[PDB]
């Protein structure tokens, strides 16, 4: 469900008040191949906030894809 996915990611991204961790979130939400969120976030080295945003948005996206 791409419509819901978009809205829920926007809702979470809005919590990050700078474009860099915003993009960390958006990038996180794109993870949908064979690597899990945990595996994929291990290579994110920008800093703790970027890692949290990537994690949260990857997790949100994954849940939504699962429920569709
Ligand atoms: Ca921008
Ligand atoms: Ca990226």
What is the maximum alpha-carbon separation in the chain? 32
Per DSSP, the residues of 4-45 read: HHHHHHHHHHTT--SHHHHHHHHHHHT--SSS-HHHHHTT--
Question: Which ligand gives the minimal distance to the CA of 28?
Answer: 2
Nearest to 19 by CA among 55, 49, 56: 49
Using CA atoms, how far residue 52 sits from 3, 48, 68, in Å, is 24, 6, 25
- Domain locations in the chain? 1-68
Ligand nearest to the CA of 30: 2
Domain 1-68 in this protein, CATH class: mainly alpha
**Ligand nearest to C-alpha 46:** 2
CA of 6 to the centre of ligand 1 (A): 16
Name residues whose C-beta falls within 8 Å of residue 13's C-beta, 6 or more positions apart in sequence: 22, 25, 26, 53, 57
The experimental method is X-ray
- Give the resolution value in Å: 2.0
Residue 62's CB is within 10 A of a number of other CB atoms, namely 16
Ligand 2 centroid–CA 2 distance in Å is 20
């Amino acid at each position: 469900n791409l419509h819901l996915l978009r809205q829920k990611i926007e809702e979470q991204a809005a919590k990050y008040k700078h474009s860099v961790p915003k993009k960390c979130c958006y990038d996180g939400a794109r993870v949908n191949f064979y690597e899990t969120c945990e595996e994929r976030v291990a290579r994110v080295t920008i800093g703790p906030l970027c890692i949290r945003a990537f994690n949260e948005c990857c997790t949100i996206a994954n849940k939504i894809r699962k429920e569709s």
